[PDB]
Structure formats: C-alpha cells, structure tokens
Amino acid sequence: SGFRKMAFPSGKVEGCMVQVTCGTTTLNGLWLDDVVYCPRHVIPNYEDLLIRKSNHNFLVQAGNVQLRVIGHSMQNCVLKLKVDTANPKTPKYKFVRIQPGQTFSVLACYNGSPSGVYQCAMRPNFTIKGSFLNGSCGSVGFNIDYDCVSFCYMHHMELPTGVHAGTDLEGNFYGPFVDRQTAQAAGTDTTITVNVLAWLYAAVINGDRWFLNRFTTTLNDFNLVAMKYNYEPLTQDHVDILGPLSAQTGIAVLDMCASLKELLQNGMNGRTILGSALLEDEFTPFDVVRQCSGVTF
Amino acid sequence: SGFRKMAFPSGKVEGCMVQVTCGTTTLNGLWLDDVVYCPRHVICTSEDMLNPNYEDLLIRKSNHNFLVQAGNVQLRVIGHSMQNCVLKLKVDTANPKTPKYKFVRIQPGQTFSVLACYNGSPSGVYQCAMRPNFTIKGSFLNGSCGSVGFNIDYDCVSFCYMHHMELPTGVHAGTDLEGNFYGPFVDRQTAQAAGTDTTITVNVLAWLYAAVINGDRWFLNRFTTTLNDFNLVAMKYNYEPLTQDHVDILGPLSAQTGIAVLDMCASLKELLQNGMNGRTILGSALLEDEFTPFDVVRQCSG
Ligand SMILES: CN1CC[C@H](C(=O)N[C@@](C)(C(=O)Nc2cncc3ccccc23)c2ccc(Cl)c(Cl)c2)C1
Ligand SMILES: [Cl-]
C-alpha cells in the first residue's frame, strides 16, 4: 500500500555529474566515457563563439580530480567536451527523446554535485515544472530500463513563469524554445489525460473507490468533454496502454473515463484521491504498474 | 523558481542494499562495513509472529541459515547478534561502497528519503515524513522490509529508518538503525493500530514561507496572533501544537520574507477557516506538511 511520487534510483547518474567552468560561468556536465555533455550556453552565433575557445578554457572538475579537455564539438544546443579520462563509473546508457506526457527523474545538481532527485513530466506545452536555481543548467532527466539509463533531458533555462526548458541529450530543445536571450513564453498547458486515468487506477488499487460510477462513455463523447476542460485528447493507444490496469482492477477504460467526466463537471466535493484534492497527471500508466507491482533496478 | 518534493540522491544508499534470506523469508539488508542490518522478523514464520520470543528463535539459528546476497556475490555470515528489533549479521566481506554514515533517530515532523527495495534491488526513491502518530505514509509492497530512510546532508548519510511493517490502514511502522521502533509499535501480530494523525504545523508554515519566496502571496493577511490563540485554533483542525522551538526555527524564513512567524500563523488560521477557494499554493490544493523549515531553506537557497 501507499502511493508516492517516486523517482528512479539516482546512483548510476550520480557517478556522471561533473562541474563545467568556462569564463565566469559554472554549470553541470554529464561525463559519459571520454565525453562531457553540457548546455552550449556555457560559452548568439555559437559556431563563431566556439571557434574562439581553446580546450584549456573549459575547466572540468569531477569531484576533486580536474579533467583535461582534449577536444570540443557542438551538436545542436549541447557542447561535447572530449576529455582524456574515460568515466570509470559510466553506466549502460542511451540517449532517448521523450514524448509529452512521459515522466522522468531529474537529478538536480549545483557545481557538479547532486543536491536532490525528483520526478516530473514533460508537459504537453513542452516545458517541465521542475525545481531549479541558478547553477542547475546541465542537470539531467532520465529513466531506468532494466540496467540501462535512458537520458532524455538536459536543463538549459527557466521561462518567465518559473517553468523550465531544455533539450534531449542530442541538443534538440523540447518545444519551440531557443537558447538565445529573447522573449520566450510557455504556451497554454493541458492536463495529461492518460496519466490522470492511470493515477485513478492507482487509487482504485489502493482502496479509493468513491469516484467510481455505474457509467461508461464513448471515446468521442469523452474527448468532447476533455477538450472543454483543457485535457489532452485520449487516443485509442492510450486506451490500449491502460488495458493492464483495466484488467487488474476490473474497470474498463471508458468506464474510468466516465468517472473522470463526472470529476471534471462536479469536482471532488471535499473528498481527496490518494491524499490529493486535484487530479494528478504526472504518473504514466507504466509508472503506476512499476510502483504497484515492484519492478527493480 | 519551482518547488518540488525532492529526495536525496540515493546513490550512497544503493551500494549498501543486499538481499537477506532466512528460510522461506526474503527481505532487504543494509550492508555497512562488515555488518548487514535487517529487521529481526526475518527469522520468524507467520505463526511465530503472534507471540514470538526472538531471543529463543535466534539461539536456534546458525550462521549458514542466513543467505546474504550482494548483487551476484553471496556473502558469508560469520556472526549474528540482535539489537532491539534489528538483526546484525556479521559478514566476512566489508562493503567497499560503504559511505560516511551515522545512525540518527528522528523526531516526528522530520522528513527523509526512502529507497524502496525488493530482493536487495532498489526500485525507487521517494520523500516522506515521520508523522506525529509515529508512522510513515510510504509506498511499500511485500518484500520491502529492510528498506531504509535517510538524509544525506554534506557527504554523510544519516540512516534514520528501517521498514518493518504495514499497519491495517496502509501506513508503515519501522525502527531507527538501532532497532528501536518509532511509536508504540512492536514486531508482533497484535491489534496495534496507528493513533489519530495530526498535521505537522511547523512544516505547513515552512511550506507557506516557500510559497511567499516563490511569488505566492494571496493567502497572506493583515492579522497577527498570539501563540496560545493560534494553538487553540490549530488544535480544532487536528494540527500539531506550535511550540516556541518551532517559532525559533522558522526565524530565518521569517527574516528572508519579512513576514513574522505569528503573522504567517494568522495566515494559516485564515486558510484553515476559509479553505483555498479554487486557488492553489505551489500547485497544491491542500496545505503541505512534508517539507521541514530546513528542506525549504536548502531548496530555496542551496
Ligand atoms: C499477505 N501477508 C500477510 C502477512 C504478511 C505481512 O504483512 N508481513 C509483514 C512482514 C509486513 O508487514 N509486510 C509488509 C511491509 N510493508 C508493506 C506491505 C504491504 C503489503 C503487505 C505486506 C507488507 C509483517 C507482518 C506482521 C508484523 Cl507484526 C510485521 Cl513486523 C511484519 C503479508
Ligand atoms: Cl529530527
């Protein structure tokens, strides 16, 4: 029993966190094998600014040991500092680009030191509601798949509303954001519907059944309602992905959709679901399964 | 900007997680130096649990009865002792990944990270608090016994909790790393139940100071209160009494925001009275009590 916002164990990522200094700027780097990846804004014609930099301009620090940079290249908005020393703690890893609605763990770092780990989701508006202070640039987002760390995010900036923007580990920004000093704003955000339904299945598994009803709905009727409440449209793939939880609890996906339809029109009415007075959208259907079955890393 | 329920990086604890098997039972152990710590109920059967005599059951045990597994490598148990409700399996190999650590006993209201494990493998990390009724609202399945709670301030891991059981309400009871249970709980199948839970007032105020720092001022008011008037109101909403110790601890937050503690107490009073009225504080429609004043400072400063 119990339901918590749970992150992946951060250990495999911790051994990869380094400090990257260039001039007056100090941020974080991800040291994998003999390459250290970091936001290119550490150095805006970025090809022109990078041509003026020398290898000894980048001071890379792994704990106490200083690493010597032997090369540098740029891939989209990530800088790739080739170092002489390969990371002995390099885990089995992949660079994956996640879709909006997908969740991941963020190991927030300052001066190459991990300060905390938290779970968050890629919002439909391509921002992440993270927790970052100055110096957190280069902190990474990741998932663990068996014994493989899938790096999906590198923090670059904070938007004027306090939400965060960053890139995948190939330097491609999530959303219409750029690493240039200009006016940027997060677009209108929507609720991740498949995740709310997954979190409702986790509540049923945990004993919370008050919100259930005898009703069902069509996928079209549900989406017409969901659209009015700024909820993401629920596709047939979302209905298919929720199948295992639907089987485990005995509540059909459209049956739970009718529960959500009533929750949106009528509300909670003083009641809570998993100790929350709002509908939670930062647990994917796989997160609910992993937590309510006991998958390990 | 931003405010999240943040856990300590679990890496230092991950290298200490081992599998402990004794008979039909498989749970988790914490391998520090040449000792593996685990709940002593690993030696019990389900029938033994009603009225177990642990000293009696431990005397019948041989070192080879405990199968300790660290990853793939099986560890050899060379001794065993019991300290309160924790079993201490002396092993012949010291943990090379042993971090700088302490055994700390926490007070209710204190928060910590839990590295939930199954079969000696870490499955996830989450943040939670020691409730005033001495239970923790964790996320645990069967096989999680031996999972630990910890704080990693500076380069030292302070182990403060070891999971032992789930109570009938779905909440959890455990011990410090010296085997002393938190609360009036025993590692015996009895009619024990968690007492009435209360909201950790000092933590709600700390989380309100985090909201003010983050730009949220809607809940503030032109009122102040006495500490006694606040406690008389707080008690009626099942809130923990706010002591002078709590008022002193909130001082740095009060100075940083410019809002006196009894001033923020008057804001809390009005929120208990009125409710949120469609509004949220740090993206929450409820008043959060699982961030201590130390958590708020660390996250909003460094
Ligand atoms: C289905 N079996 C019936 C009894 C078994 C049972 O509960 N056993 C344990 C070990 C226990 O609390 N384990 C657990 C821990 N955390 C979370 C749990 C979530 C679910 C199920 C067990 C969970 C236990 C039992 C009685 C006592 Cl007094 C103690 Cl100290 C420990 C389960
Ligand atoms: Cl404490």
For chain B, give every domain's residue range: 1-14+100-197, 15-99, 198-301
Do B296 and B206 contact (CB within 8 A), yes or no? yes
Nearest CB partner across the interface for B123, out of A117, A130, A294: A294
Q: Which of A12, A115, A117, A163 to mutate to test the interface with B (most CBs of B within 10 A)?
A: A117
**What is the C-alpha to C-alpha distance for residues A120 and A102, in angstroms, rounded to an integer?**
9
Cα(B75)–Cα(B64) distance, rounded to whole angstroms? 10
Ligand closest to the CA atom of residue B112: 2
Q: How far apart are CA B161 and CA B181, in angstroms?
A: 9
The approach used to solve this structure was X-ray
CB atoms within 10 A of CB A214: 6
Helix (H, G, I), strand (E, B) or coil at A173: strand
Bridge partners, A113 (sequence order): A110
Gaps after residue numbers in chain A (C–N over 2.5 angstroms): 43
Q: Is A6 exposed, middle or buried (0-12, 13-18, 19+ CB in 10 A)?
A: buried
- Substitution target in B3, B6, B287 with the highest count of A β-carbons within 10 Å is B6
Q: Which long-range contacts (CB under 8 A, 24 or more apart) does A244-249 make?
A: A244/A285, A244/A289, A245/A198, A245/A201, A245/A202, A245/A205, A245/A285, A245/A288, A245/A289, A246/A201, A248/A201, A248/A205, A249/A201, A249/A204, A249/A205
Cα distance between residue A217 and residue A220, in whole Å: 8
What resolution (Å)?
2.2
Architecture field, domain B1-14+100-197: Beta Barrel (2.40)
Handedness of CA A149, A152, A154, A155 (dihedral sign): negative
C-alpha separations of A271 from A195, A279, B106, B285 in Å: 20, 11, 32, 12
For every residue of A30-59, DSSP letters joined together read EEETTEEEEEGGG---HHHHHHT--GGGEE
Beta strands A78-83 and A92-95, pairing class: unpaired
Token code pair at residue A249: 């609890």
Structure tokens at B55: 């000293």
For A50-63, b where at least 16 C-beta lie within 10 A, e where not — what string?
eeebeeeebebbbe
CA-to-CA distance for A20 and A36, rounded, in angstroms?
9
CATH topology of domain B15-99: Thrombin, subunit H (2.40.10)
Q: Residues near A182 by Cβ (< 8 Å), separated by ≥ 6?
A: none
User: B46 C-alpha to center of ligand 1: Å?
Assistant: 9
Active site residue B41: yes
Q: Which residues of A are catalytic?
A: 41, 137
Structure-token match 């032109």, residue found: B222
Q: Which of B145, B163, B164, B172 is catalytic?
A: B145
A248 sits in which H/E element: helix A243-249
- How far apart are the C-alpha atoms of A33 and B266, rounded to whole Å? 55
At residue A284's C-alpha, the angle toward residues A280 and A290, to 5°, is 115
- In sequence order, what are the beta bridge partners of A142? A105, A151
Which DSSP symbol is given to A130?
-
- Decide: helix, strand or coil at residue A241: helix
| Nearest to B283, CA basis, from A153, A130, A116, A4 | A130
Find the helix or strand (DSSP H, E) in which A260 lies: helix A253-266
AA letter at B286: L
CATH architecture of the domain with residue range A15-91: Beta Barrel (2.40)
Residues in chain A, total? 297
Q: Longest Cα pair distance anywhere in chain A, in angstroms?
A: 68
DSSP H or E stretch at residue A257: helix A253-266
Give chain B as a 3 state SS string. Answer: CCCCCCECCCHHHHCCEEEEEECCEEEEEEEECCEEEEEHHHHCCCCHHHCCCHHHHHHCCCHHHEEEEECCEEECEEEEEEECCEEEEEECCCCCCCCEEEECCCCCCCEEEEEEEECCEEEEEEEEEECCCCCECCCCCCCCCCCEEEECCCCEEEEEEEEEEECCCCCEEEECCCCCECCCCCCCCCCCCCCCCCECHHHHHHHHHHHHHCCCCCCCCCCCCCHHHHHHHHHHCCECCCCHHHHHHCHHHHHHHCCCHHHHHHHHHHHHHHCCCCCCECCECCCCCCCCHHHHHHHCCC
Contact predicate A121/A195, CB 8 Å: yes
**Which residue has the least CA distance to atom 2 on ligand 1?**
B142
CB-based burial of residue A86 (10 Å sphere; 0-12 exposed, 13-18 middle, 19+ buried)? exposed
- What residues flank ligand 1, with Cβ below 6 Å? A 1; B 41, 49, 140-142, 144-145, 164-166, 172, 187-189
**Beta carbons of A76 and A113 less than 8 angstroms apart:** no
* Alpha-helical regions (H) of A152-242: 193-205, 219-228, 236-241
Distance, in angstroms, between A224 CA and closest chain B CA? 24
Neighbours of B221 (CB within 10 A): 13
CATH code reported for the domain at B198-301? 1.10.1840.10
- Specify whether domain A190-293 bears CATH 1.10.1840.10: yes
Check for a shared fold between B1-14+100-197 and B15-99: yes
Cα A87 to Cα A18: distance, rounded to the nearest angstrom: 10
Q: How far is CA B76 from CA A264, B34, B73, B222, in A?
A: 58, 10, 10, 66
Q: Which ligand is nearest to the CA of B117?
A: 1
- If residue A75 lies in a helix (H) or strand (E), which one and from where to where? strand A69-75
Q: Which of B144, B134, B18 is nearest to B73 (CA)?
A: B18
CB proximity B148 to A under 8 Å: no
Find the helix or strand (DSSP H, E) in which A17 lies: strand A17-22
Which tokens in the block code for residue A206?
């945990």
- Look at domain A1-14+92-189 and name its CATH class: mainly beta
